Design a binder for these strands. Structure first.
Ligand SMILES: *OP(=O)(O)OC[C@H]1O[C@@H](n2cnc3c(N)ncnc32)[C@H](O)[C@@H]1O
Length: 392
RNA sequence: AUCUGGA
RNA sequence: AUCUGGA
């Protein structure tokens, strides 16, 4: 019933009129101290990798340092920063700054002590924002001091391959087309983000570029805005009604939002959606839940804190089908570990499709169409993805 | 449950 | 994208 009273909506922008955006300026001393920490750790070989990139579109020759951690390092207690996605720079006047700040690393239920359901009830306060987890690759956008718009993927920017478009360049091309539609320029977006001292955080979803799990055809393809972060060492993020307002003003597609006050209603909603893996007539792969947390409870200040809840089925089966389809075209015996009966039928359908049209083999080997193949099989059986997973 | 090690 | 040894 809770999955029928709560619906993900993209119309919270009208409710942002009374809300005020967070803002904090950068302290060069604090930034310098952060970079001193990270520069030492990259020289110990708590491991850190540092990669320097030139910003091609910068009129002043700006450069950025990307800093990458081991994903498990973020469980350690005293790191310099818990940002996942971090680019630093020096302006033309020599001031060291954070150019791009992703979200803090966040974890699944029962992956860490803090993400045990008992810990979430204890240490967190609502309201709780459930944001729909779209599935592609992350794109960061910010504005440099010289007016340049910076577009990055998780850890990189620019293009290496002359043949293949990098993820960061593909995100930039989608942003270009999105601004031209609404008569705005990259320079305009760069000045607004720098004014807010902010990184916009979006998901690139486009099957013509790269297929993942769910299908994003032409009607659903583009940049999905899901966060805005302050470019500072600690983690401060916009409320999601303001994120949706920003998306409308700058031509991003919006990320569905549900607001639930009580934490017990949250688990109830999530464990209910998990049975189908679908909500509001749409396949959902997960939610990111956003709230407030403190150190020792009821004391100290409250900080922005996330956790994710990812639905295992029918998606674990879809990955098995993708892996088995790769086995067919490469001459290997598919590894059918679970969902044995329904998977064996899927493979006979696939072998059948590759006989009619041999051009499919070349497409499936370029990692394209495997998602259309899956839905065409499910249509052929009159089944929904969640039903094939429950056949047991 | 918990405690502890690696990645 | 997160797995894993032991008591
Ligand atoms: O485990 P994981 O890679 O799925 O980690 C989370 C990643 O999911 C992407 N994403 C998509 N939608 C969201 C929302 N609403 N909030 C936060 N992250 C989101 C990001 O690319 C992230 O790295």
């Amino acid at each position: 019933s809770l999955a029928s009273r709560y619906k993900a909506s993209t119309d919270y922008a009208k409710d942002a009129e009374g809300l005020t955006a967070p803002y904090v300026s950068q302290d060069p001393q604090e930034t310098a101290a952060l970079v001193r920490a990270l520069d030492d750790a990259a020289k110990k070989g708590f491991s850190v990798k540092k990669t320097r990139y030139a910003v091609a579109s910068s009129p002043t020759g700006a450069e950025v340092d990307s800093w990458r951690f081991n994903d498990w390092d973020y469980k350690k207690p005293d790191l310099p920063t818990y940002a996942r996605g971090l680019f630093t720079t020096r302006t033309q006047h020599g001031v060291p700054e954070i150019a791009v700040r992703g979200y803090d690393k966040f974890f699944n239920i029962d992956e860490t002590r803090d993400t045990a359901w008992s810990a979430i009830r204890e240490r967190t306060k609502g309201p709780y924002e459930l944001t729909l987890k779209e599935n592609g690759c992350i794109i960061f956008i910010s504005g440099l001091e010289d007016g340049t718009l910076l577009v990055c993927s998780k850890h990189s920017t620019g293009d290496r391959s002359d043949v293949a478009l990098s993820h960061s360049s593909a995100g930039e091309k989608h942003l270009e087309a999105q601004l031209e539609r609404i008569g705005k320029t990259k320079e305009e977006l760069a000045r607004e983000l720098r004014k807010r001292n902010a990184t916009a955080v979006a998901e690139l979803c486009d099957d013509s570029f790269e297929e993942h799990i769910l299908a994003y055809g032409p009607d659903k393809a583009g940049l999905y805005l899901h966060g805005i972060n302050l470019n500072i060492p600690e983690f401060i993020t916009y409320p999601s009604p303001l994120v949706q307002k920003f998306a409308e003003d700058w031509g991003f597609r919006k990320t569905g939002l549900i607001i639930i006050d009580n934490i017990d209603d949250v688990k109830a909603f999530l464990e209910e959606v998990a049975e189908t893996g679908a909500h509001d007539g749409r396949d959902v792969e997960g939610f990111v839940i956003r709230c407030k947390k403190s150190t020792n409870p009821g004391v100290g200040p409250y900080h922005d804190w996330f956790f994710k809840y990812k639905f295992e089925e029918p998606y674990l089966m879809y990955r098995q089908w993708r892996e088995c389809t790769k086995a067919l075209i490469s001459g290997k015996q598919p590894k059918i570990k679970k969902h044995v009966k329904i998977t064996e039928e899927y493979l006979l359908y696939a072998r059948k499709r590759l006989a009619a049209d041999p051009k499919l083999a070349k497409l499936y080997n370029q990692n394209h169409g495997i998602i259309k193949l899956r839905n065409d099989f499910l249509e052929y059986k009159n089944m929904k993805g969640t039903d094939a997973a429950n056949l047991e």
